[PDB]
Design a protein around this ligand. Structure first.
Ligand code: NI
Length: 184
């Protein structure tokens, strides 16, 4: 019956369609560079298996110019009261998984912002451009926002990838299993 108990019980991934099971539905500000985003089934051509969740069967593949996509989550509509967010400032945990092919290098970027109701940027985590592992292995990136102050209403998740070779097709970074949740 404590708050810790309820927030633990209500913890769930607030991002829609994290793996591409619904194609691009639920993603906004979609930028299709080169040949655009494409959804592929695991394990990818010249790629490795997703040993970590098993319910993950698909990923998004990028191309030869930047492919980006974003989602904005309304924390209040998901039932996190403004008073709770202002006073307790519970942990907002962001994770993403990325990999590349073994026949070509690639690059990935993630930018996550906490936003007020008027879209003021209250906190920001940005990777910059990251070199994807050459060996095809899946890598997790994780960030926890805490002590971010009052006023947080939205989380804007944005990520992207491109290849390092400039080749027609889908040789860029692959992303999947993206998540945002609130934990005590
Ligand atoms: Ni309790």
């Amino acid at each position: 019956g404590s708050h810790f108990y309820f927030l633990s019980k209500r913890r769930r991934n607030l991002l829609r369609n994290p793996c591409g099971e619904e194609d691009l539905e639920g993603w906004s500000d979609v930028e299709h560079g080169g040949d655009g985003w494409k959804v592929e089934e695991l394990p990818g051509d010249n790629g490795v298996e997703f040993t970590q969740d098993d319910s993950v069967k698909k990923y998004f593949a990028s191309s030869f110019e930047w492919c980006r996509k974003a989602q904005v989550i309304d924390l209040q509509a998901e039932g996190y009261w403004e008073e709770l967010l202002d006073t307790t400032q519970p942990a907002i945990v962001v994770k993403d998984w990325y990999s590349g092919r073994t026949d070509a290098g690639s690059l990935y970027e993630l930018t996550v912002r906490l936003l007020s109701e008027n879209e003021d940027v209250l906190a920001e985590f940005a990777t910059g451009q990251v070199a994807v592992p050459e060996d095809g292995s899946w890598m997790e990136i994780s960030h926890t926002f805490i002590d971010y102050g009052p006023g947080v209403r939205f989380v804007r998740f944005e990520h992207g990838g491109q290849d390092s070779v400039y080749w027609k097709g889908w040789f860029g970074a692959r992303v999947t299993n993206s998540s945002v949740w609130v934990e005590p």
